[PDB]
Amino acid sequence: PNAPACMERQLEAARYRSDGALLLGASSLSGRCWAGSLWLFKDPCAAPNEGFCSAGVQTEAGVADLTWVGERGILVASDSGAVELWELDENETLIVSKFCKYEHDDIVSTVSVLSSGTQAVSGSKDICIKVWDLAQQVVLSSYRAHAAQVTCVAASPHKDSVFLSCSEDNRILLWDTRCPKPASQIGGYLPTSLAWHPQQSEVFVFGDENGTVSLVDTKSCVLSSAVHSQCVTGLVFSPHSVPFLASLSEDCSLAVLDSSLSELFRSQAHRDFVRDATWSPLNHSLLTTVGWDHQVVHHVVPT
């Protein structure tokens, strides 16, 4: 009922919004048609059953990343090189294209909404990082700071001009776009994922291609834990005030760590790669994960 018939096998993204509804993005990474879809599940526990979802749509190409923009809006990094804005209709039954802008020269790998919800930054295999105005539907700035593919960008929580980026050039860049030279490098195995601490302006975690999660202060080297046996694909801080850290990986496992990076939960529910994780806003110890095994898993995290 409402949308396209067959949601694609390779689950890339899952993100809860305020009211507890589940945003799913997917790609087909094999078979005749290499494309993508978006889904809203106003009931998580049903997903990923197409029939028993609230809205969904076909994208021209694969979904490599996406993020919620406020409540109505979905921001998508495409294989086509385009950044796309889609929005829910008033009835949250339909997902309509607001813009599809082909500005990158290769796959858009990573996308992140700034502080204010008015602007976003994308990173690409084209090696460039780009700052968008979402109302004016234009690129405001374009930066070739890196020397290789951009793996991840992550907007600061509270400052529109600040975000982190990391790349296969072995650089983690801390950006402030109010300086003439906006980027600064921070000390490797290749960095593969980035999250800001939700309660410290000053702090962040990064995952490396070798399975290590690292805690970094701007103010200060590091603290580290060998958490995974391969690439750390994602780091998402839980919504609690002393928050947990969810780590996911190509080793097909999810771990949840404390602020000292000691292990609390481990799940092997997935049979392929774990692509994304999002914590319930209703139940701060529900954690939802998705993977290329097409499973949406609902873990109760002990807290």
């Binding site: 096998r9 390779q10 790609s27 990474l29 094999s30 078979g31 005749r32 048609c33 290499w34 494309a35 021209e60 190409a61 694969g62 490599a64 495409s78 294989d79 086509s80 090189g81 082909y102 500005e103 990158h104 020269d105 290769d106 796959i107 295999k125 084209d126 090696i127 930066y143 070739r144 700071a145 890196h146 020397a147 290789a148 593919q149 050039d169 650089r171 860049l173 300086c179 030279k181 906006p182 980027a183 600064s184 490098q185 195995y189 291609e209 070798n210 046996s229 391969q230 190509e250 080793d251 097909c252 049979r271 392929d272 790669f273 290329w292 095994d293």
Partner: protein, 625 residues
């Protein structure tokens, strides 16, 4: 008019995507063969057991389409040289898998990136693939003019960009490629897709690249400017490079997104076509040379071998050569016979090597324009060409045996000559044995007789050319020295090459030669100032000749007689390529050696390192007397 593909990293439906692209005007599509984000495990459970089709079906296109329309791209996550062991092994397995599928589909080419310094494992896996089964995909190594690290914006506050003149720095990407193709042993299946950026290096850097096997030049949409009307176009510097690349019939690839959104798309192509329809047109020499570009031939030995009818015909259809012989003889007839003496003085002219007679008609043409009188002898040893002469003799002429079927070194001449006229020169001047042939005819030149030509001088210049080094290896033959191919010269319209230093004179011969020894043997040392990091693969040879006074022929490129077809350069190879640094001197030594039966060249490099002596004792190459 010009051949071009479209590079995409996103292909939702192969058929719709190919059709859009065929419509735009492109000839082929470089695309991924597995989805560029579909990372695969080969070792660790449970992701190694991922079900399902690993990629899309061979059945989506015809075999004809796979074979002609599609260049494959290695998956961008494949990192055979990663410092993580697990990634190195997954990447090894994944590279063999994608290469094997490319071979399975019969793709004509496959693109692999050289985007860093250390590609040892990439090299070693591609080498193993090449030595596994029966497949003939070309490998296009995608290498930037400028490393990404060197064209980054200077926006990192605590890691500034190396500012001043960094000299081996913007040659880093050539050393990436050179290390790689040396690891793979100069395999003929491994060529270059040269990726052009917003900025360009030295004319010298771009010079080295044009001695390398470039099959494709990659043009990003981003490096194009806009004109008034809103169409895409290029800097005058980027236009220069296109013009040089078109002079290697390389394929053009357009990569990145459409950036001219008022103007349709195919306009990037339209503009390459525009540049292509608008180069200076081939000169007479360039039109005739088309087809012969880096084709190696055996130098003719017209002394030892009786030339074919059709060989003479190419040497005859060279008007500028015979035009210059006509003038040289004219100027000679005027210096020899004063105006009072005009009708009493018959000058005795002998053509030595008359073939089918064009120097004879040149001698006649000369005599009418100088209005002096001549008595003509034509000496030819090739009895086949003697038939052509003796028929022309019995049909035209009617007066005098004219034609004498004889070796000019045996012939008893009725009479001494005022002038001997000959064209016994090859690509290296003296390599058809002009010196020996004229020394043996000299005795019937009058004590004040003139030889036309009076002089010739060979020239040499060191070169780089990895195509020309492979054409030479390809000359390996069963039942001889496995290295004999490198110890002999080749007449070759040198095309895909780099001249490393200016030609300098090697051997000079004068006629007549009244030194009481003659001694046509020779030893010459030559010092070549170099100014790039390069490989020496061999020496180009050229020559110049004085016919009479200031009337000359040249194939030395800086003095090349214009529109003259008869002679292409010669190439002397070396067995092992020799690294040369900017500032270094190439020292080369040439000998012209002989016995009573044979003449040959031996040659050695003595700086900046020694080669072996090449062709010692003519063990691999002789010119028969």
């Amino acid at each position: 008019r010009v051949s071009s593909g479209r590079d995409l990293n996103c292909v939702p439906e192969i058929a719709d995507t190919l059709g859009a692209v065929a419509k735009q005007g492109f000839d082929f599509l470089c695309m991924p063969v597995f989805h560029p984000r579909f990372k695969r495990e080969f070792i660790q459970e449970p992701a190694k057991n991922r079900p399902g089709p690993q990629t899309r079906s061979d059945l989506l296109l015809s075999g004809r389409d796979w074979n002609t329309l599609i260049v494959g791209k290695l998956s961008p996550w494949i990192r055979p040289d990663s410092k993580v062991e697990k990634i190195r092994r997954n990447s090894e397995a994944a590279m063999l898998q994608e290469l094997n599928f490319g071979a399975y589909l019969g793709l004509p080419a496959f693109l692999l990136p050289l985007n860093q310094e250390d590609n040892t494992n990439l090299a070693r896996v591609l080498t193993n693939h090449i030595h596994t089964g029966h497949h003939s995909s070309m490998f296009w190594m995608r290498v930037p003019l400028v490393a990404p690290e060197d064209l980054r914006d200077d926006i990192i506050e605590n890691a500034p960009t190396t500012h001043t003149e960094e000299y081996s720095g913007e040659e880093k990407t050539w050393m990436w490629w050179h290390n790689f193709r040396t690891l793979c042993d100069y395999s003929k299946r491994i060529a270059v897709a040269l990726e052009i950026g917003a900025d360009l290096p030295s004319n010298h850097v771009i010079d080295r690249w044009l001695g390398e096997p470039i099959k494709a030049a990659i043009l990003p949409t981003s490096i194009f400017l806009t004109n008034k009307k809103g169409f895409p176009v290029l800097s005058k510097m980027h236009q220069r490079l296109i013009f040089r690349l078109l002079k290697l019939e390389v394929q053009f690839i357009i990569t990145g997104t459409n950036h001219h959104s008022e103007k349709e798309f195919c306009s990037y192509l339209q503009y390459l076509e525009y540049l292509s329809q608008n180069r200076p047109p081939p000169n007479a020499y360039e039109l005739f040379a088309k087809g012969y570009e880096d084709y190696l031939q055996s130098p003719l030995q017209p002394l030892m071998d009786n030339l074919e009818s059709q060989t003479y015909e190419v040497f005859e259809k060279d008007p500028i050569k015979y035009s210059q012989y006509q003038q040289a003889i004219y100027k000679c007839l005027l210096d020899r016979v004063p105006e009072e003496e005009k009708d009493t003085n018959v000058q005795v002219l002998m053509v030595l090597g008359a073939g089918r007679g064009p120097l004879v008609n040149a001698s006649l043409r000369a005599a009418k324009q100088a209005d002096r009188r001549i008595k003509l002898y034509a000496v030819e040893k090739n009895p086949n060409a003697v038939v052509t002469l003796e028929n022309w003799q019995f049909e035209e002429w009617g007066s005098q045996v004219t034609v004498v079927s004889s070796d000019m070194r045996e012939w008893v001449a009725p009479e001494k000559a005022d002038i001997i006229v000959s064209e016994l020169l090859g690509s290296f001047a003296d390599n058809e044995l002009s010196p020996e042939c004229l020394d043996g005819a000299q005795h019937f030149l009058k004590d004040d007789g003139v030889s036309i030509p009076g002089e010739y001088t060979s020239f040499l210049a060191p070169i780089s050319s990895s195509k020309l080094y492979n054409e030479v290896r390809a000359c390996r033959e069963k039942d001889r020295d496995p290295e004999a191919q490198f110890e002999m010269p080749y007449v070759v319209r040198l095309h895909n090459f780099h001249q490393l230093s200016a030609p300098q004179p090697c051997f000079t011969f004068s006629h007549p030669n009244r030194d009481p020894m003659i001694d046509n043997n020779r030893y010459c040392t030559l010092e070549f100032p170099v100014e790039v990091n390069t490989v020496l693969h061999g020496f180009a040879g050229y020559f110049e000749t004085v016919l009479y006074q200031d009337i000359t022929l040249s194939i030395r490129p800086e003095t090349h007689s214009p529109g003259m077809f008869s002679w292409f350069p010669i190439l002397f190879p070396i067995k092992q390529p020799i690294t040369v640094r900017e500032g270094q001197t190439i020292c080369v030594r040439f000998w012209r050696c002989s016995n009573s039966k044979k003449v040959w060249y031996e040659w050695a490099v003595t700086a900046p390192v020694c080669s072996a002596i090449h062709n010692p004792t003519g063990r691999s190459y002789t010119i028969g007397l």
